[PDB]
């Protein structure tokens, strides 16, 4: 979304109340995170707590491993509720953006003020706390969805093009899953058909081998600030933490069937945090429930059985596929009756163009026959 004066006025008016609300949310989220971190350190697996090292097979660069460095706390409901987890995730996003802005301010002293003016003129990178009314919140969500639309197609295309150019699926079912994975949101994708793509891509690329450019695109699509990007293991850590929280909440909801009892707005927010339901689509409860059930089905039974989610790259692609809108086409079909090269009509045809028209025109067969006969006669005379 482009900046505007109205949004600038809105954010300037709500600047200090927004900061106060952000501080209160910071205290609450620190409490929640303290509970969660204590639980992880106490009951977490040895590899997860000790931060086991997983190195790439080519350049031996460490990155988070989905199996070892990610853990689903099945018993987190006792200490932390689902709403607290959602609050923590939202605060994590807001705190990331605020921390980047504060770092810029500290780095550049008082010279960041005009850049702050640019910042407050757009809702893309402002915290949710800056909105004090429903309309402002709707505009902020619209800006976030616009950024997601802007960013996701690049990530999807990167993944698909790299895999298709450097590899092909093994079997027909994998082919169908791969082809149907990257369909536009206007059609409904069957998670059962699409799941094998997760194993196929695990064979190709895991989350531990994700490239830095693809990571940048993904972080853009998740509304995670990317500047300064730095090494790939910082935003990678952010992504891992966010999706670990999301998986814990998803396990809680699946086990307790909370989504059925969840209200309409809370359900919409829950889907949105999973990048499943844009607000500009004006989805109803039926569609939200369908998408959430499809997401749970894609996670698969193994997620509940052992807390193991499918490949995170493929999961991110699948969820972001809902922001891959069909390519725009505007204009009545009658426009196809016009011509594009009328301005050249005055130039006419030169000798070469006339020759080409004569040779390759409707008389082409006659010209070919005459030319071949003449050439054969000349060759015979030569011999």
């Amino acid at each position: 979304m482009q900046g505007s004066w109205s949004v600038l006025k809105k954010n300037c008016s709500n600047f200090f109340p927004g900061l106060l609300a952000f501080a209160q949310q910071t205290q609450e989220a620190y409490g929640i995170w303290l509970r969660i971190y204590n639980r992880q350190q106490k009951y977490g697996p040895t590899d997860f707590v000790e931060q086991s090292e997983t190195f790439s097979p080519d350049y031996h660069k460490r990155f988070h491993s989905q199996d070892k460095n990610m853990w689903v706390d099945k018993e987190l409901c006792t200490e932390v509720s689902q709403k607290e987890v959602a609050r923590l995730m939202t605060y994590k996003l807001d705190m990331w953006r605020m921390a980047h802005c504060a770092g810029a301010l500290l780095a550049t002293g008082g010279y960041a003020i005009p850049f702050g003016l640019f910042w407050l003129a757009n809702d893309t990178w402002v915290p949710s706390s800056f909105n004090l009314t429903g309309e402002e919140l709707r505009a902020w969500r619209e800006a976030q969805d616009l950024y997601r639309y802007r960013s996701a197609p690049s990530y999807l295309t990167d993944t698909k093009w790299h895999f298709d150019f450097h590899a092909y699926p093994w079997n027909e079912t994998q082919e169908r899953a791969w082809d149907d994975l990257f369909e536009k949101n206007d059609v409904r994708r069957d998670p059962k058909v699409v799941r094998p793509a997760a194993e196929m891509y695990d064979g190709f690329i895991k989350f531990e081998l994700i490239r830095r450019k693809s990571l940048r695109h993904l972080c853009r699509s998740m509304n995670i600030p990317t500047f300064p990007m730095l090494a790939r293991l910082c935003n990678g850590t952010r992504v891992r933490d966010y999706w670990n929280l999301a998986w814990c909440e998803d396990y809680m909801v699946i086990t307790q069937r909370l989504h059925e009892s969840m209200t309409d707005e809370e359900l919409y927010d829950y889907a949105w945090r999973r990048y499943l339901a844009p607000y500009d689509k004006n989805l109803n409860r039926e569609q939200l429930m369908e998408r959430v059930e499809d997401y749970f089905e894609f996670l698969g039974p193994d997620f509940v059985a052992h807390g193991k989610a499918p490949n995170l790259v493929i999961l991110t692609n699948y969820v972001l596929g809902y922001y891959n809108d069909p390519a725009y086409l505007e204009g009545d079909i009658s426009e196809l009756d016009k011509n594009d090269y009328d301005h050249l009509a005055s130039w006419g045809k030169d000798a070469f163009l006339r020759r080409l028209e004569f040779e390759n025109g409707p008389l082409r067969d006659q010209v070919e026959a005459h030319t071949q006969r003449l050439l054969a006669e000349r060759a015979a005379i030569a011999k």
Partner: protein, 135 residues
């Protein structure tokens, strides 16, 4: 907010200078947008007429520049050094004398390394002025 980062933010109307632009595009497209105009890395086209037209024009303007701006400096230096060492001394001559001197300079250029050396080496016994004539 001040300036847009998107090229979509137009500054003019779609019909601004449509006609002249169409004429310019007609000039560009007629010979270049053809199947046989396959370029080699965008630098060497496939149309023969492009070469036939562009090589002479390039040579002509380069030669005009070289003759009227670059070699002129050498010619003027020769005239000044050989006929007083000052611009006024050269201007004291007539146009015909300057023409003669400049044509001799052209002769020297044409001879280069493949010609007689008496044009710059004074044979012993020559009566013509030496290097210390003006000193």
């Amino acid at each position: 907010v001040l300036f847009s980062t998107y090229r979509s933010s137009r500054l003019v109307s779609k019909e601004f200078l449509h006609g002249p632009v169409m004429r310019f595009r007609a000039l560009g497209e007629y010979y270049f947008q053809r199947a046989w105009n396959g370029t080699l890395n965008w630098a060497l086209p496939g149309e023969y007429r492009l070469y036939a037209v562009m090589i002479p024009f390039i040579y002509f303007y380069h030669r005009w520049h070289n003759d009227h701006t670059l070699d002129r400096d050498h010619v003027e230096k020769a005239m000044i050094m050989r006929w007083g060492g000052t611009l006024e001394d050269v201007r004291k001559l007539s146009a015909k004398d300057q023409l003669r001197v400049r044509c001799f300079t052209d002769i020297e250029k044409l001879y280069s390394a493949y010609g007689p050396k008496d044009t710059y080496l004074q044979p012993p016994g020559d009566t013509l002025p030496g290097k210390d004539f003006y000193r």
